Structure 1
Amino acid sequence: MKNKQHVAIFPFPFGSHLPPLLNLVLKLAHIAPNTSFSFIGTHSSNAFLFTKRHIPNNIRVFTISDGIPEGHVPANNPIEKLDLFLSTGPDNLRKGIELAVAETKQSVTCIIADAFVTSSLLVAQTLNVPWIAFWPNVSCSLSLYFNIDLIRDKCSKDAKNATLDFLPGLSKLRVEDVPQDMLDVGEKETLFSRTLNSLGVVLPQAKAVVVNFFAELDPPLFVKYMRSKLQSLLYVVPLPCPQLLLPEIDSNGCLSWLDSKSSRSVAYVCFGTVVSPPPQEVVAVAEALEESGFPFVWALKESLLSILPKGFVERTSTRGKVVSWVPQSHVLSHGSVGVFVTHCGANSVMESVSNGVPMICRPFFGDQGIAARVIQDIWEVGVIVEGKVFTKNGFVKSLNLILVQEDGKKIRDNALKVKQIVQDAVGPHGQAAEDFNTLVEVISSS
């Protein structure tokens, strides 16, 4: 019989959502070389992933609209382009299906989609194929979408530090950690926020939900709770397969620089590429780093150099590196790095915990607040920066706590324990090995 298995894949076609889904598809394509995988992105998302990159023969890339009509210039805010893409609806997605079917000469048998592309469920239902939702965000935030009314009520009535005890396994989460998007009502609501708020109804319709994380690190009650809500909950190890990686020149000599430093002595600072930090916090970060005296590597966008204190880079040049880019995977795996100062983006956190690096957290956006809370109060492998925003005195205190003080020993010890848990999780007997096989059979059975 001719193999006619054909998986269509819809990323959420924006930055941090792209590599984790390609990573998963690469793994699936390698184990099932007789199966077609059709990756459907926008021109900009395809450029982002596939420019420098060779892909296996059974992965083909197709392009659909980004929802930005020619001539339009989106405002400088991180939600507009998301709304515009989501507004293109299932018909834009079906144009992708058409291209994939025409090239492969095979009807689609299964869809894998980033959970945020909820229109792809309608597409799957129209084709009568299974819909597999992919979750590359903070694993724990899944629970929020099944409890929106309780969360809104508590956030409106209760104290800011009140705990969300109604979420099994997640009683450490607080009102103040909740994504603002899920609370906004009226004019503040966006197509993006409305889409996220529909996840409680959308996700149980998925044949399986695939979580890009380590099941062994999530609270067991949370995992049980999610299993009770979904048809199938599968964890696939988020670590990069070799084909995802693109060999890169360490232009700034980060690793060599780190080689000259003592074990667990260096602060690696990176606060993301999606929301601009308030300039006053950028200044605060610089002042604290300089005053702390600790060695540091700060990955900072070029456009922010002009707001750093005059002479800061020059005065710290003998103990710090302020650079536009670092090979973060390699930096976080370097033994010299003793703390990761982070906005708590999901992939950053994944890399930090898998390498045993404790964190100082300043969540800015989305579910970063959930991640920060899990890091501090559940895993206990870090702290939310003293003050909840970067200040010179507060950040200096957090740096000392984690890097040098005996009071930070528990956190340092916990980071090593969590690293060992991850190492055993990605092993041949971890849950994920079985869950990956389960996913493969869903695709082969479709």
Structure 2
Amino acid sequence: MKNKQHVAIFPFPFGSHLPPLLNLVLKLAHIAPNTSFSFIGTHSSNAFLFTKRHIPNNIRVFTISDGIPEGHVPANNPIEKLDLFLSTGPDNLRKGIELAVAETKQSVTCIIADAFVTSSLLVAQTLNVPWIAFWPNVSCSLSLYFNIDLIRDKCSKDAKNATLDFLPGLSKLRVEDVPQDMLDVGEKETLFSRTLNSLGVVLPQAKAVVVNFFAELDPPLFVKYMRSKLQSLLYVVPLPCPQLLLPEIDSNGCLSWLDSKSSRSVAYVCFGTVVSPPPQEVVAVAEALEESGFPFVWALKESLLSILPKGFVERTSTRGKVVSWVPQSHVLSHGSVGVFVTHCGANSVMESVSNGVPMICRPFFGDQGIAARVIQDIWEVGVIVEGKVFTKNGFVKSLNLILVQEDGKKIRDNALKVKQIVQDAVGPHGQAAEDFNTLVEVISSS
């Protein structure tokens, strides 16, 4: 009997949502080299992943519309392009299915999609095939989508520091930690935010939900709570497959520089690539790094070099690196790095906690505030920067706290404890090992 298994993959075709899903498909394609995997992206998303890379032959790439008609120029906000792609609907997706079916001569037996591509659930129901949701976001934020009415009711009536005790295992979460887009109603409501607010209804219809995180790092009551809301909640280790990482050159010379510093002494700063912070904070971050005296690697926009204080990069050159790019995963896995100043992106948090590096947190939007709260009040592996925004005096006090002071010994100790938990979790007898195989069997019997 010939193998007729054919998995259709629908990523959220944007930046940070692309590597973690290809990473999962790579592992799946390796353990099941007889099963066909059809990765369906846009021209820009496919150019992003598959340009340099070489992939196993049972993975095939197909192209659909980005939702941006030719001639049109999207505005400089990170939401429009997401909206335009989401507006393509299930018909654009089914076009990707057509390309897959025509190439493999196999009908689709299973679909794996990023949870945001909620239209792929519609496709899965039409084909009568199981729908598997991939969650590359902050894991703890899954619970929010099943209590939107309560969250909205509390965020309006109650104080901003009021706790969300109705969230099992996440009582530490506050009103001010809630993503703004699930509070926005009316004109400020986007197709992207309408999609995200549909998750509490969309997610339970999934055969399985695959969380790109370590099951042992989430509050047990949260995990249990989500298992009550979903048909299946699976965790698969977010650490890269050997096929994922691309051999890249240390052009800036970050690593060799880090070897010249002593253990846990360097501050690594990178506040995202999606949202640019207000120039006054950029000035404040620069001012704080200089006043502090600590060695630092600052991954900064090339376009933000002009708003930096005059002479800053030059006066700090003998103890600091201001660069356009860093091999972040390698930088965070270096012993010299003592603190990670982050916007709290799901991937950045993953990379920091798995390397025992404590974090100074300044969340900008989305689930980054959920991440920040967990880092500070739950895992206790870092702090939100004083005042929730970057200031010269506040950020220096955060740097001092984590890097050198005895008051931050608990946090540095917890950073090491969590790393050990991750190292054990990615082990052969961790949860994900059992869960990864559950996923393979779902695909096998699809």
Other structure's SS at 1:306 match:
coil
Deviation at 1:260, TM superposition (A): 0.3
Deviation at 1:263, TM superposition (A): 0.1
Give CA-to-partner distance per residue, 1:64-114, whole Å, 9 cap, x none: 000000010000001000000000000000000000000000000000000
Other structure's SS at 1:224 match:
helix
Give CA-to-partner distance per residue, 1:245-285, whole Å, 9 cap, x none: 10000001111000000000000000000011100000000
Deviation at 1:301, TM superposition (A): 1.0
Give CA-to-partner distance per residue, 1:364-421, whole Å, 9 cap, x none: 0110000000000000000000110000000000000000000000000000000000
Report the counterpart of residue 198 of structure 1 in structure 2: 198
Q: Does 1:67 align with 2:106?
A: no
Report the counterpart of residue 39 of structure 1 in structure 2: 39
Deviation at 1:16, TM superposition (A): 0.4
Correspondence 1:326-337 to 2 at 5 A: 326-337=326-337
Deviation at 1:241, TM superposition (A): 0.6
- Distance in 2 of aligned mates of 1:298 and 1:63: 36
- Distance in 1 of aligned mates of 2:56 and 2:160: 50
Deviation at 1:125, TM superposition (A): 0.2
- Distance in 2 of aligned mates of 1:418 and 1:233: 22
Report the counterpart of residue 9 of structure 2 in structure 1: 9
Report the counterpart of residue 436 of structure 2 in structure 1: 436
Deviation at 1:354, TM superposition (A): 0.1
Deviation at 1:319, TM superposition (A): 0.1
Correspondence 1:355-366 to 2 at 5 A: 355-366=355-366
Deviation at 1:332, TM superposition (A): 0.3
Other structure's SS at 1:298 match:
strand
- Distance in 1 of aligned mates of 2:195 and 2:347: 22
Deviation at 1:33, TM superposition (A): 0.1
Give unmatched runs, 5+ long, in structure 2: none
Give CA-to-partner distance per residue, 1:211-246, whole Å, 9 cap, x none: 000000000000000000000000000000110010
Deviation at 1:9, TM superposition (A): 0.2
- Distance in 1 of aligned mates of 2:14 and 2:31: 27
Other structure's SS at 1:276 match:
coil
Give CA-to-partner distance per residue, 1:33-80, whole Å, 9 cap, x none: 000000000000001101110000000000000000001000000100
Give unmatched runs, 5+ long, in structure 1: none
- Distance in 1 of aligned mates of 2:284 and 2:54: 42
- Distance in 1 of aligned mates of 2:51 and 2:158: 49
- Distance in 2 of aligned mates of 1:242 and 1:269: 27
Give CA-to-partner distance per residue, 1:164-215, whole Å, 9 cap, x none: 0000000000000000000000001000000000000000000000000000
Other structure's SS at 1:414 match:
helix
TM-score (norm 1): 1.00
- Distance in 1 of aligned mates of 2:74 and 2:341: 31
- Distance in 2 of aligned mates of 1:111 and 1:43: 20
Deviation at 1:144, TM superposition (A): 0.3
Report the counterpart of residue 151 of structure 1 in structure 2: 151
Report the counterpart of residue 378 of structure 1 in structure 2: 378
- Distance in 1 of aligned mates of 2:196 and 2:289: 37
- Distance in 1 of aligned mates of 2:399 and 2:355: 19
Give CA-to-partner distance per residue, 1:326-366, whole Å, 9 cap, x none: 11111000000000000000000000000000000000011
- Distance in 1 of aligned mates of 2:56 and 2:234: 25
- Distance in 2 of aligned mates of 1:329 and 1:183: 34
Give CA-to-partner distance per residue, 1:117-143, whole Å, 9 cap, x none: 000000000000000000000000000
- Distance in 2 of aligned mates of 1:258 and 1:49: 29
- Distance in 2 of aligned mates of 1:178 and 1:134: 21
TM-score (norm 2): 1.00
Runs (4+) of structure 1 moved beyond 2 Å? none
Other structure's SS at 1:38 match:
strand
Report the counterpart of residue 21 of structure 1 in structure 2: 21
- Distance in 2 of aligned mates of 1:187 and 1:328: 38
Other structure's SS at 2:7 match:
strand
- Distance in 1 of aligned mates of 2:385 and 2:254: 25
Other structure's SS at 2:326 match:
coil
Correspondence 1:282-431 to 2 at 5 A: 282-431=282-431
Report the counterpart of residue 258 of structure 1 in structure 2: 258
- Distance in 2 of aligned mates of 1:151 and 1:16: 27
